[PDB]
Amino acid sequence: IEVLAVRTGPDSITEIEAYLNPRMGQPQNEDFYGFSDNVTVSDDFGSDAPPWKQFPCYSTARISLPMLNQDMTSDTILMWEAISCRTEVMGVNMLTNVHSAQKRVYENDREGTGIGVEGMGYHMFAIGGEPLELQFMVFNHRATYPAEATVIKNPGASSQVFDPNLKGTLTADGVFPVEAWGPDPFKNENTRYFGQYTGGTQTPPVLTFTNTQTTILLDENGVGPLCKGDGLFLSCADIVGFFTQHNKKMSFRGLPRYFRVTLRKRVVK
Amino acid sequence: IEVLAVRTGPDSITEIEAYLNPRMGQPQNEDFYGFSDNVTVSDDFGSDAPPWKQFPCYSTARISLPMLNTILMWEAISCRTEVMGVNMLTNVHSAQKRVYENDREGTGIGVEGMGYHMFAIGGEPLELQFMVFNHRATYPAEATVIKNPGASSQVFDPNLKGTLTADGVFPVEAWGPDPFKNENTRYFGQYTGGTQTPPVLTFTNTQTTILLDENGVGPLCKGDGLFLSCADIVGFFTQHNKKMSFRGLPRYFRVTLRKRVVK
Amino acid sequence: IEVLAVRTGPDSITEIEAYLNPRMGQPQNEDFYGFSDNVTVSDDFGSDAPPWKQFPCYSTARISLPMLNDTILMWEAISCRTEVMGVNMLTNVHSAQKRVYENDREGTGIGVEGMGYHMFAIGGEPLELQFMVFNHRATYPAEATVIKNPGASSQVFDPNLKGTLTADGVFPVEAWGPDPFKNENTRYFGQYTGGTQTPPVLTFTNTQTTILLDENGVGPLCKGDGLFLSCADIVGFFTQHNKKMSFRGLPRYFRVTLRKRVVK
Amino acid sequence: IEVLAVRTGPDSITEIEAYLNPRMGQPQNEDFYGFSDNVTVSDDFGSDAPPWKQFPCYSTARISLPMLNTILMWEAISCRTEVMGVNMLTNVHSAQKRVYENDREGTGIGVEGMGYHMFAIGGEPLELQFMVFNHRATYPAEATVIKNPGASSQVFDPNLKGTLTADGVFPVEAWGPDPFKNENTRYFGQYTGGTQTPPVLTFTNTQTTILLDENGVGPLCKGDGLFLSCADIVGFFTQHNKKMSFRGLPRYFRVTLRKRVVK
Amino acid sequence: IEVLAVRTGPDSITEIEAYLNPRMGQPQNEDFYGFSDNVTVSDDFGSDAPPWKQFPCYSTARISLPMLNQDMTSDTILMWEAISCRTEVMGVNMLTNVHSAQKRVYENDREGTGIGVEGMGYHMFAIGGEPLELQFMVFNHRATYPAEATVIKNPGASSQVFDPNLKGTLTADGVFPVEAWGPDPFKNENTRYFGQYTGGTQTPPVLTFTNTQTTILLDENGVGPLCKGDGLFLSCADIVGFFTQHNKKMSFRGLPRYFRVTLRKRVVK
Ligand SMILES: CC(=O)N[C@H]1[C@@H](O[C@H]2[C@@H](O)[C@@H](CO)O[C@@H](O[C@H]3[C@@H](O)[C@@H](CO)O[C@H](O[C@@H]4[C@H](O)[C@@H](O)[C@H](O)O[C@@H]4CO)[C@@H]3O)[C@@H]2NC(C)=O)O[C@H](CO)[C@H](O)[C@@H]1O
Ligand SMILES: CC(=O)N[C@H]1[C@@H](O[C@H]2[C@@H](O)[C@@H](CO)O[C@@H](O[C@H]3[C@@H](O)[C@@H](CO)O[C@H](O[C@@H]4[C@H](O)[C@@H](O)[C@H](O)O[C@@H]4CO)[C@@H]3O)[C@@H]2NC(C)=O)O[C@H](CO)[C@H](O)[C@@H]1O
Ligand SMILES: CC(=O)N[C@H]1[C@@H](O[C@H]2[C@@H](O)[C@@H](CO)O[C@@H](O[C@H]3[C@@H](O)[C@@H](CO)O[C@H](O[C@@H]4[C@H](O)[C@@H](O)[C@H](O)O[C@@H]4CO)[C@@H]3O)[C@@H]2NC(C)=O)O[C@H](CO)[C@H](O)[C@@H]1O
Ligand SMILES: CC(=O)N[C@H]1[C@@H](O[C@H]2[C@@H](O)[C@@H](CO)O[C@@H](O[C@H]3[C@@H](O)[C@@H](CO)O[C@H](O[C@@H]4[C@H](O)[C@@H](O)[C@H](O)O[C@@H]4CO)[C@@H]3O)[C@@H]2NC(C)=O)O[C@H](CO)[C@H](O)[C@@H]1O
Ligand SMILES: CC(=O)N[C@H]1[C@@H](O[C@H]2[C@@H](O)[C@@H](CO)O[C@@H](O[C@H]3[C@@H](O)[C@@H](CO)O[C@H](O[C@@H]4[C@H](O)[C@@H](O)[C@H](O)O[C@@H]4CO)[C@@H]3O)[C@@H]2NC(C)=O)O[C@H](CO)[C@H](O)[C@@H]1O
Ligand SMILES: CC(=O)N[C@@H]1[C@@H](O)[C@H](O[C@@H]2O[C@H](CO[C@]3(C(=O)O)C[C@H](O)[C@@H](NC(C)=O)[C@H]([C@H](O)[C@H](O)CO)O3)[C@H](O)[C@H](O)[C@H]2O)[C@@H](CO)O[C@H]1O
Ligand SMILES: CC(=O)N[C@@H]1[C@@H](O)[C@H](O[C@@H]2O[C@H](CO[C@]3(C(=O)O)C[C@H](O)[C@@H](NC(C)=O)[C@H]([C@H](O)[C@H](O)CO)O3)[C@H](O)[C@H](O)[C@H]2O)[C@@H](CO)O[C@H]1O
Ligand SMILES: CC(=O)N[C@H]1[C@H]([C@H](O)[C@H](O)CO)O[C@@](O)(C(=O)O)C[C@@H]1O
């Protein structure tokens, strides 16, 4: 796309608000919505098969944007340009719950609070004018992913590091395993992505929330994501950490993410 | 509201100071004020019923500003906020499980574990999203919750809304600020989890937060009311017998307001 | 004070330096100076009497400034440098410390660990205090300055429970903190890091300046030509071989720059 | 080089992207690619021989830039660099020691312990200082080291120099960037130690590092070659039987260069 | 010193590079160079004698500076003024070693990596125009330091906090105990010092290195350290943590520090 002037005038700025609910593995609108199922662990890389529901997948949506009021006789067209966003992890408040079927601090004395949600935090969101471009990369290439999940079958040993042949695009919600796909830095010219990972299984989650924080989406040339087909593409994963039962079974807990995106009209050839 | 120019003049600027005491669960002005009761844990999400006093609720107050009456409204432009009583956490003598419990020796372990620190300043009640760890939790009569909220309440459900209209009855673990509303409120929150996490608190009288949005407009005080909200969970208090309670701290608010003309 | 203009001139700016030694509980010029005594723990809030020497108290000093005079002159504190001193001593892991591998009588001492409480205040009058305690039923010793029978509301904010920091080494840290409702003529700064096995984190440099001017460009104004310095610097806990634990504190350095201010 | 004006014109600016795969010890395109072999520990410094495959080495590449030829040289002005595959660390199912290994229950403990993250961009190979924890370590024949380095190699010895001239054979534990040289390279590194430390990793396509020195001169690419180097140790992978291995991640580089006139 | 104008001109700016090796206690150019000897612990403050080699001392050097080419007939004097520095802890790379004679993560199973270096980090450097001025302060005043060490003997109970009588100057390398001396904030008008302490015995060391970071040494008056007798005084201590043997004996491990200092000519009266 050849990028020209910002289009100013009334109705040249618009704002969308959207949510993505987490896809930690357990089915929608059933009792464990927001959790994975209890995590089983293989004995060997050669006999490793994570059952469906026991691992998180990326959340993704395309938002239909307002009509642009195109200049019919112009050589150029208008595109919605994402210039900034606010994003918040919602429901951070629920993590003050230390009474709901949790392994207790002093379990052998049957006493104390629940241990609450602890362990790894993976927080990533992406905002783009097209689907997020992905690099396939896995901890163990011999893992057999279930048929429900979108992966590269038989990826080979090279997939445990960078292999330029192992590409994909985030085209579906709740099926691309977080542990098998990451943003592709060789692409995503038309998307901004941000991730943080904090590991461990006893690590305290650290989360902030405010309605006062803006992130600029303009690149070094002052150009934000340009919305192809008048679609805004939102992607995230928000693993907060693990829920531990009394019997020590552990499951991923996730939280939904809020997006507010400010878009302006851009002239393109 | 269509917002016009800041109305300058004598007594155009005012300033309020307020405190909000914590609502950690134990009754006001009795021996465990500032604490929850000892936390009990359910064996299943199906049979989860947190008794009244065992969980914290949000604090809220409405501050009467000077009557004013295009109309004039009070606009919140800046604020200072402090957690008060951080000094008390230097107490490691008061009935605390000891570092070397089996040698009956050492200091108390003091207050540790999760920190949840949030405040809000607005010209109307804080707009809330209902969201729970376990939708099947049965909250007590004293608590304001959405009864039988359903499985979608464990993540974001756009039907599950409320507003912070009463002090010390909205469970922290059941309500958070709604980012889809609150256009006339600024809110700020941090959570640090765990049960043995070291608390970290700063205090100074030197730090100001600006409450103006991108357009230079602060919260506009509907009915000449300034709405203040917070929760300040510092961590857990552990008894010798390993019973654990929430401990909270009061919050100081200084808010500077100016006269603003609105349509 | 109605504050008028900065009085500029040859003798218009002065600098003071002072130290406050910590008040962790053990008596001055004796073998445990800088420490508390070994901490004892009550069984319940109803029978809770922290003995003298077993808890730290605030340090405070009034520095006499050069005597100055419709209007009068007052020293205005415009900036300060403050440092925790003797951070170097915490590299000591040989001095009668519980060992890392106590069961094997092997490894270093565990050193100082646990809670950090670092606070200082610079003002033109005594620091204004809010009384607030973990447990209102605690019986404080005769040596300590507290509000006796403070009531259940002293566990949170009670607007009646006020004091001013008017004596060194007797206001328990665990019973008093800065009053944000007052202190218009004082600047205070504090950080608490809790826990009993937390690593202490301390920095020191001679290159950091804190500006003491308020939003209106006025610093603390020294009433009666007095500059009021306050701090508490709890570094953490010293653990003996027999698992007895004491507070360890460090002294704090102040450099304060003051200018002459005309007031009505 | 004496440095003169920046050359300007249609093709005065070029951008390269490159990846360096990690060199953690296990052979490429085999089943443990990205890991070290299981780490064995010596009994004393005098009998200390870390087997090949059990320790990480530095990754390195020379990128061929467009040929140019007062001479013209490519000047590296800025870069973006990202650790790739951070996503893979959400795997807590693959042959890992479990959180409650005695109960055969809970997630894997995942990757934890030491982080070593460093990268360098230069117009010649990275200049290295040899420095080892134990000078008596006997490195294997596959490794490039200073043999019999002396007790002084446990600290700084100005005799113990090298250059990173080969990928996957300079051990991280024996070579670091030489601050007495690398006038024509920019390096950056972070070490977080321990064996149960939680890894902390961030990734974004939005961060630029400026490579210009105080004089406004970037790395000047000798022989029209751009030299990339890194090491990205994320932590340790722990088996059920408690055998531990280094896990590494590949690094992405984007470097912007401009034509620069020199003597 | 009456400080006057900066002297500009062709040779008015110079850069020096230097290293200070650590003085952790074990002898130079022997097998444990860079370590302390294994730390013994007293039972009581009254019977406390840290043996020579079991505790780190401060590193210090006077760097001889290039000739100034003085104005022979001028009433004024040129002095080198230290305006900025880069400083780097070197050898951070070596701490990736978890194989050399280290207590293992799973010592009972004789399995896992070494625990590596962990515990306290003490990192201070000072750049001055004269020797660093010290304040004597000890954890325990009744400690008897070895004859090899420079201390104030029988310093009294006041030496456990601030005593204005208990001063010294860092006049020798490898003999001033870190645990007995720190920078005197009441002096050092002609030196800049910087210190960080992170305590504990199992704390993870955190160290960064770059050739891109510069520290300005100018005071509030735009004046850097002025190098008296044309000497630049460099000091540091860089305790990284402890090394733990299989038999649980523990030693300090230190690292060398790199200094690059930029100096300009300053006219003084
Ligand atoms: C992640 C995974 O699937 N692991 C399962 C695997 O473990 C083996 C692997 O981690 C390989 C990777 O190289 O290492 C094996 O351990 C061996 C090697 O490190 C070896 C040196 O290369 O050293 C030890 O073996 C020596 C000797 O060298 C061998 O030739 C000999 O057969 O055995 C010797 C034993 O002292 C070391 O043990 C891993 N093996 C074990 C055991 O951990 O497969 C095992 C089943 O064997 C488990 O299923 C793991 O989950
Ligand atoms: C949070 C809560 O209230 N938990 C209580 C509940 O625990 C069960 C839930 O955590 C569900 C969530 O899906 O999982 C149960 O564990 C099961 C499942 O993960 C299952 C796969 O979906 O895999 C295991 O069960 C298999 C098999 O599928 C079962 O049909 C069979 O009966 O047992 C197999 C065991 O190998 C896994 O156990 C949780 N159940 C238990 C048990 O943890 O219910 C229990 C009592 O049942 C407790 O009250 C929990 O607190
Ligand atoms: C800080 C302090 O001084 N603690 C001492 C105190 O502990 C008691 C207090 O913490 C109060 C605060 O509300 O709670 C008591 O625990 C009770 C309550 O939480 C109660 C619900 O309010 O639930 C339990 O008690 C029930 C029942 O109500 C009792 O009547 C019955 O005898 O026990 C039931 C057990 O299921 C809960 O235990 C604290 N009590 C104990 C015990 O910890 O007083 C105790 C001695 O009683 C110690 O001196 C503490 O140090
Ligand atoms: C890193 C390594 O290779 N360690 C192996 C080595 O450990 C010895 C080294 O750590 C040296 C370093 O100085 O110290 C030995 O421990 C000694 C010394 O600290 C010594 C004072 O210099 O004090 C103790 O020894 C005294 C006495 O001096 C000895 O002559 C007498 O035999 O023992 C006395 C008992 O207190 C102290 O133990 C380290 N020795 C031991 C043992 O840990 O050598 C050992 C086996 O000898 C292992 O191979 C280590 O891995
Ligand atoms: C750092 C050091 O050298 N410690 C060694 C020392 O420990 C003693 C000191 O820590 C002093 C400091 O004031 O306290 C002793 O513990 C006592 C005191 O805290 C006392 C109140 O002041 O309370 C306890 O003692 C009570 C009673 O008050 C005493 O009068 C009576 O003799 O003992 C009572 C026992 O309950 C508390 O124990 C420290 N003593 C001990 C023991 O820790 O000396 C000891 C040997 O005495 C060791 O050498 C320490 O390393
Ligand atoms: C991947 C595979 O084929 N593994 C084989 C084992 O399944 C098998 O042992 C049987 O395991 C049964 C339970 O199987 C799963 C499960 O659903 O729990 C299958 C999952 O794929 C597996 N998880 C992963 C991440 O690979 C999971 C896990 O290994 C364990 O639950 C431990 O947490 O096992 C059932 O319990 C049978 O009783 C048991 O025989 C063995 C048979 O030798 O072969 C394995 O290769
Ligand atoms: C300082 C003093 O006077 N200590 C006396 C002890 O030395 C003495 O017990 C004897 O100790 C012998 C070993 O002495 C050292 C050592 O290991 O070299 C001497 C060190 O000065 C001391 N360290 C410190 C920091 O004070 C060190 C330490 O206490 C222990 O090693 C434990 O780590 O001891 C040897 O073991 C003899 O067998 C032993 O008798 C006792 C005698 O009762 O009095 C102490 O006052
Ligand atoms: C969250 C929850 O469901 N708590 C319930 C507890 C716990 O199940 C157990 O005490 C475990 O501590 O049991 C009660 O009898 C009680 O203590 O009075 C009723 C309470 O409703």
Short mmCIF file of N, CA and C and ligand atoms in Angstrom, two decimals, chain C residues 26 32 36-40 53-54 95-96 238 240-242 244, chain E residues 43-46 142, ligand 5:
data_model
loop_
_atom_site.label_atom_id
_atom_site.label_comp_id
_atom_site.label_asym_id
_atom_site.label_seq_id
_atom_site.Cartn_x
_atom_site.Cartn_y
_atom_site.Cartn_z
N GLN C 26 17.88 -1.19 71.68
CA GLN C 26 19.00 -1.39 72.63
C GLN C 26 19.62 -0.04 72.94
N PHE C 32 24.93 -3.72 71.99
CA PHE C 32 23.87 -3.97 70.97
C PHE C 32 23.31 -2.69 70.38
N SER C 36 17.59 -3.90 68.04
CA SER C 36 16.59 -4.16 69.10
C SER C 36 17.11 -5.31 69.96
N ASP C 37 16.52 -5.44 71.13
CA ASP C 37 16.61 -6.69 71.90
C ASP C 37 15.87 -7.81 71.15
N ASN C 38 16.09 -9.06 71.56
CA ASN C 38 15.42 -10.25 70.97
C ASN C 38 13.89 -10.16 71.08
N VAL C 39 13.21 -10.35 69.95
CA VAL C 39 11.76 -10.06 69.84
C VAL C 39 11.01 -11.27 70.40
N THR C 40 10.08 -11.00 71.31
CA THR C 40 9.09 -11.96 71.88
C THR C 40 7.74 -11.68 71.22
N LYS C 53 12.77 -1.85 74.43
CA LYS C 53 14.01 -2.32 73.74
C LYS C 53 13.68 -3.32 72.63
N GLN C 54 12.44 -3.79 72.49
CA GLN C 54 12.16 -4.92 71.54
C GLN C 54 11.51 -4.41 70.24
N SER C 95 29.29 -12.86 62.03
CA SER C 95 29.13 -12.35 63.43
C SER C 95 27.92 -13.02 64.12
N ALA C 96 28.11 -14.24 64.63
CA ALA C 96 27.18 -14.94 65.55
C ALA C 96 25.80 -15.08 64.91
N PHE C 238 18.35 -9.51 62.42
CA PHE C 238 19.52 -10.33 62.80
C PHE C 238 19.01 -11.60 63.48
N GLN C 240 20.16 -15.02 65.50
CA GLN C 240 21.19 -15.79 66.27
C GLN C 240 21.15 -17.28 65.91
N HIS C 241 22.19 -18.03 66.28
CA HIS C 241 22.23 -19.52 66.18
C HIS C 241 20.99 -20.13 66.86
N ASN C 242 20.54 -19.55 67.96
CA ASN C 242 19.41 -20.14 68.72
C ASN C 242 18.07 -19.60 68.22
N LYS C 244 16.81 -16.64 67.92
CA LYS C 244 16.34 -15.32 68.40
C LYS C 244 16.61 -14.28 67.33
N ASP E 43 30.14 -17.78 67.50
CA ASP E 43 28.97 -18.22 68.31
C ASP E 43 28.39 -17.02 69.06
N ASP E 44 29.15 -15.93 69.15
CA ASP E 44 28.88 -14.77 70.05
C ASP E 44 29.68 -13.59 69.49
N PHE E 45 29.18 -12.36 69.63
CA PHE E 45 29.84 -11.10 69.19
C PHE E 45 31.13 -10.93 69.99
N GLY E 46 31.16 -11.42 71.23
CA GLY E 46 32.33 -11.28 72.13
C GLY E 46 33.47 -12.23 71.78
N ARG E 142 32.80 -5.56 68.59
CA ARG E 142 33.72 -6.47 69.34
C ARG E 142 34.43 -7.44 68.40
C1 LIG F 5 24.77 -11.45 69.27
C2 LIG F 5 25.26 -12.30 70.39
O1 LIG F 5 26.43 -12.22 70.72
N1 LIG F 5 24.35 -13.10 70.98
C3 LIG F 5 24.73 -14.07 72.01
C4 LIG F 5 24.15 -13.67 73.35
O2 LIG F 5 22.72 -13.58 73.17
C5 LIG F 5 22.08 -12.71 74.09
C6 LIG F 5 21.86 -11.32 73.51
O3 LIG F 5 21.24 -11.42 72.21
C7 LIG F 5 21.01 -10.48 74.45
C8 LIG F 5 20.85 -9.09 73.91
O4 LIG F 5 20.10 -8.25 74.81
O5 LIG F 5 19.76 -11.13 74.65
C9 LIG F 5 19.87 -12.41 75.18
O6 LIG F 5 18.59 -12.97 75.10
C10 LIG F 5 17.77 -12.67 76.25
C11 LIG F 5 17.34 -11.22 76.37
O7 LIG F 5 16.66 -10.78 75.16
C12 LIG F 5 16.34 -11.09 77.55
C13 LIG F 5 15.71 -9.73 77.66
O8 LIG F 5 16.65 -8.68 77.64
O9 LIG F 5 15.22 -11.99 77.34
C14 LIG F 5 15.58 -13.36 77.25
O10 LIG F 5 16.28 -13.75 78.45
C15 LIG F 5 15.40 -14.10 79.54
C16 LIG F 5 15.62 -13.16 80.71
O11 LIG F 5 15.32 -11.81 80.44
C17 LIG F 5 17.09 -13.24 81.08
O12 LIG F 5 17.39 -12.28 82.10
C18 LIG F 5 17.41 -14.67 81.45
O13 LIG F 5 18.80 -14.79 81.70
O14 LIG F 5 17.08 -15.54 80.38
C19 LIG F 5 15.71 -15.50 80.04
C20 LIG F 5 15.55 -16.62 79.05
O15 LIG F 5 14.26 -16.63 78.46
C21 LIG F 5 16.54 -13.55 76.09
O16 LIG F 5 16.99 -14.85 76.15
C22 LIG F 5 20.74 -13.35 74.38
N2 LIG F 5 20.85 -14.65 75.00
C23 LIG F 5 20.48 -15.75 74.36
C24 LIG F 5 20.47 -17.04 75.13
O17 LIG F 5 20.14 -15.70 73.18
O18 LIG F 5 24.48 -14.65 74.35
C25 LIG F 5 24.09 -15.99 74.04
C26 LIG F 5 24.44 -16.93 75.19
O19 LIG F 5 23.94 -16.29 76.34
C27 LIG F 5 24.70 -16.47 72.74
O20 LIG F 5 26.14 -16.51 72.86
C28 LIG F 5 24.36 -15.49 71.61
O21 LIG F 5 25.09 -15.87 70.44
#
